[PDB]
Design a protein around this ligand. Structure first.
Ligand SMILES: O=c1ccn([C@@H]2O[C@H](COP(=O)(O)OP(=O)(O)O[C@H]3O[C@H](CO)[C@@H](O)[C@H](O)[C@H]3O)[C@@H](O)[C@H]2O)c(=O)[nH]1
Ligand SMILES: O=c1ccn([C@@H]2O[C@H](COP(=O)(O)OP(=O)(O)O[C@H]3O[C@H](CO)[C@@H](O)[C@H](O)[C@H]3O)[C@@H](O)[C@H]2O)c(=O)[nH]1
Ligand SMILES: O=c1ccn([C@@H]2O[C@H](COP(=O)(O)OP(=O)(O)O[C@H]3O[C@H](CO)[C@@H](O)[C@H](O)[C@H]3O)[C@@H](O)[C@H]2O)c(=O)[nH]1
Ligand SMILES: O=c1ccn([C@@H]2O[C@H](COP(=O)(O)OP(=O)(O)O[C@H]3O[C@H](CO)[C@@H](O)[C@H](O)[C@H]3O)[C@@H](O)[C@H]2O)c(=O)[nH]1
Ligand SMILES: [Mg+2]
Ligand SMILES: [Mg+2]
Ligand SMILES: [Mg+2]
Ligand SMILES: [Mg+2]
Lengths: 274, 275, 280, 275
């Protein structure tokens, strides 16, 4: 597995007007765009062929991941060995392919939109609005890539949440295979806490097998009138293998205002000042 | 009446890379509002509806944010979430935006001289958006300074009392006191070693300038760091013209620095976005 | 109530038109960027302004506003791909970037050429200024550029100047037409101006070509102008007001003009510049 | 079967400076339609709806041309949404465009290898948009070649008979003749000296390639002008595989040269614009 897909064509509503001309995934956490954390995360797991589904402010994605000749000459007097090491590696070690999602019909349609970039290969999906950090060990995506070579199924990252906060996520339920691994049998997107079948909510880290594409084409609109992955993975869990995995590490919900501030404050004390 | 405001936004922003690789430091958002948007709403509150932006590395993010977005109108179509956009929309309908490039980074003074085609022979305000200035209790810092200009009709410089140890990070002025908050600038030095700054009154990024400053910038030689400093050009004006330093009403976060940027983020989330 | 008639230093370029005649190509590019063989229409125009001594260029941008900006800004990528010398081609554009200052402002809604010129008011101020419509490709290889001729005439008589040329009476509905007293063979004092009149109602056969010298009171006159032909605000109608209680001169310029706002003139200009300029 | 088409558009295009400064040579307009739009309509006509563009110096104008324009729609309200827009809306309606950047201009072969993430392990067509090919009497050149591929399932290269004096401008092929217009290639040379030109038959910018060409390009050393030539890579394929040359039916204009660009403009003006 060497491919990673990044959906970045949402409405990004909780951060207007800042997200007017840049996607929610480009917001900087102190000094690093959300999506740059995620791309560095995928390279750690060996996924060096990056594919980005773009929408409004698509141009902020591209310009960030180009060889900037303006920036190149402005910083002639180095000190890029102090600030650009991370972004430069990405440009020299990764390939970036971009494709446009014309109409916002949900995450599932966004994942289906990137099919020509993936083909008949297993691929990872990273939702950058979920900032995942594991400074102690390997990042969440590497945890899931190592898990794929062993089980060779779809893997979805999850973590327990409060039951009142359950209608904000997709939630899975199933029998346990290991200390932190589950056989999924049911998946619902943003259910009513009364109908919440579990307290095990997905973060947006997914490892998908190419047969998911033909399943998304069979998925009908669900929560919010959008085509949810969650429903496409559900169909895959019945006739196939889909594992839920409680990752090791810290996650911030940077799709929310509150979570973004937590991430900004966290990364300043533990990442910037150092 | 003073009606133009200039925004230098062609800095290196070396402290906020890589995020500033393709967007200027002045476009960083506190919670969900770019720094420069606060400043333009500040300028419009003072009656300055003719905005001119001097652009540099990430020129497209400045233009794209203050441009009408026909895509945005289609995605948030039919009233929908205008609750997040009223501020920016008002700017687009009531303000005019003009852009000009600074291709060589030679200092804040040179950047202001670069905006001369956008200004001409009339007084204008200069705003450094990396200084987030807020006055919840009343008029904005720029509105305060515009009212002072209509009165004295000379160049006005925003200042604030600063600890003596941090005097090497700002421009410092000194002069005789005309009022508890207004000083007639005698002396101006950029970033002074702390037992050489003539006072502990530091310049904040808000100016009102008279057109004669342009020809004074052309006579200014490179100073601190080899850059052309508006502080040095403003010194020449003090000698045989009027320059007033004003201790403004309000709070200023140093969002040009990483620590001040977070102070502003946390403050605005608790008092403004959560509201 | 005092009109400044001082030295001219600024030139304004309206480039926010819909450009429907070349619509596929202009989807993301202004009609004024269509290359005549290898040089964009507007580059010809800005070189015209530099020859006249006007190094302060303001561009009113629209749909493909980004094609304009990228062509006149310092492209660091372009310099990297050479810096070793195929700058025979880049002599003209590098000159413009080194000797001119460019400022841009957007026209939000298309209400006409007059509204477009008013849109550039923040770039101009209370100054006399020239206006160039880049879809009118003007060449004078045996002498001065059209705008250079017009600047010389302004410096002497200090009025608003409108470049004109005689055209057949049947094509009069494509242009604005003037009529007035003839001071000398190539100079007229304008009395009346109508935009795209029907051939029966045309004041003369003297058609306005996109080269203007304007005094800054035209701005206040554009704001008083009511929508005209097609519901747009025409500069012709504001200049009509100025011609009444002021001085507006029509100038029969020397040189060849191509109508590159029409497909036919675009093809004609392409072949002319290819044979007489490109293999040279 | 085959559904993908690749468009290299990251050349230097210096013959068209300064017009190409911020736009690729493949975006130049022929009277009113960009050169690369003709080519994509050609690819759609052949059933190739998955478009991949390898971009470079003017990569922005490309993206913009094939992306949805909310501004252009708002500016029209169902009016001239026929006119010249008919062709380009169908393209955005029926195709999927993916873009990847060519960081280093090392040749046409390197440009095709750069697009490997967009193609994968499946056959694809390559189109050089500077070759304007028009066949008003039937199928498009690419359509002809896709039909030929469905039978032989080799790599197919479009060729054209040219005078021996022009062989240093093209890649030239030589091989045993299968039919009056189909040849089994065993030799391929890029821009040979007319004296050593192996034949009269010159390569036009239309290809059908099998995915093993990718690994062939990585093994290819710098050729003509020190650049990586697909001609040299296709040579390797012809020796250890099957490569067919096809005298296509239709008229081709060399819009990579100024003279041929004028020819295309005049031709398309008389025969297509009025129509
Ligand atoms: O049409 C669309 C909609 C969304 N996105 C992107 O998809 C991601 C997630 O979209 P978002 O609006 O944040 O959805 P959520 O409310 O977060 O829900 C999703 O993300 C959760 C984890 O963050 C999962 O638990 C849920 O199952 C999943 O539905 C973001 O990158 C969006 O930009 C697109 O690219 N296209
Ligand atoms: O060539 C340049 C350099 C800077 N800038 C911009 O202008 C401002 C410069 O500020 P900065 O680079 O942070 O310098 P400072 O340390 O801010 O110093 C200036 O701003 C302080 C207010 O914050 C004052 O105290 C000082 O007198 C004054 O020199 C920023 O918005 C830059 O983006 C330009 O546009 N062009
Ligand atoms: O709302 C608008 C309309 C036009 N333009 C620009 O201004 C010029 C207008 O040209 P065009 O649309 O071709 O107008 P014309 O029909 O050619 O008419 C103008 O040009 C003729 C000379 O070329 C004159 O005779 C007319 O009086 C004058 O109105 C072009 O550069 C446009 O891009 C704008 O910027 N904004
Ligand atoms: O590093 C590069 C070089 C070129 N190109 C593109 O490749 C195409 C062809 O480049 P060009 O320089 O025009 O090549 P030619 O000299 O025309 O030669 C090519 O096209 C000829 C016919 O047009 C063939 O006969 C040759 O074999 C083939 O190499 C154009 O789209 C270029 O932009 C790239 O994308 N990257
Ligand atoms: Mg989310
Ligand atoms: Mg500062
Ligand atoms: Mg015209
Ligand atoms: Mg070629």
């Amino acid at each position: 597995i060497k491919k990673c897909l990044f959906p970045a064509a949402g409405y990004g509503t909780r951060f207007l007007p800042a997200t007017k001309a840049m996607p929610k995934e480009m917001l900087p956490v102190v000094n690093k765009p959300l999506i740059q954390y995620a791309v560095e995360e995928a390279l750690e797991a060996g996924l060096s062929e990056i594919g980005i589904v773009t929408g409004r402010g698509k141009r902020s994605l591209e310009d960030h991941f180009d060889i900037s000749y303006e920036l190149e000459h402005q910083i002639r007097n180095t000190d890029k060995e102090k600030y650009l090491v991370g972004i430069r590696r990405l440009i020299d070690e990764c390939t970036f392919a971009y494709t446009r999602q014309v109409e916002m019909k949900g995450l599932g349609h966004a994942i289906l939109t990137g099919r020509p970039l993936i083909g008949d290969e297993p691929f990872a999906v990273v939702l950058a609005d979920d900032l995942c950090l594991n400074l102690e060990g390997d990042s969440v995506l590497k945890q899931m890539v190592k898990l794929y070579n062993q089980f060779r199924c779809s893997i979805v990252a999850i973590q327990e949440v409060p039951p009142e906060e359950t209608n904000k996520y997709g939630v899975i339920a199933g029998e346990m295979i290991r200390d932190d691994i589950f056989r999924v049998n049911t998946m619902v997107e943003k259910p009513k806490p009364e109908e919440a079948p579990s307290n095990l909510a997905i973060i947006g880290r997914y490892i998908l097998t190419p047969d998911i594409f033909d399943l998304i084409e069979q998925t009908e609109p669900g929560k919010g009138g959008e085509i949810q992955i969650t429903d496409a993975l559900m169909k895959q869990a019945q006739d196939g293998c889909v594992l839920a995995y409680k990752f090791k590490g810290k996650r911030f919900d940077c799709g929310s205002a509150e979570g973004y501030i937590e991430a900004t404050n966290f990364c300043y004390e533990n990442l910037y000042k150092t």
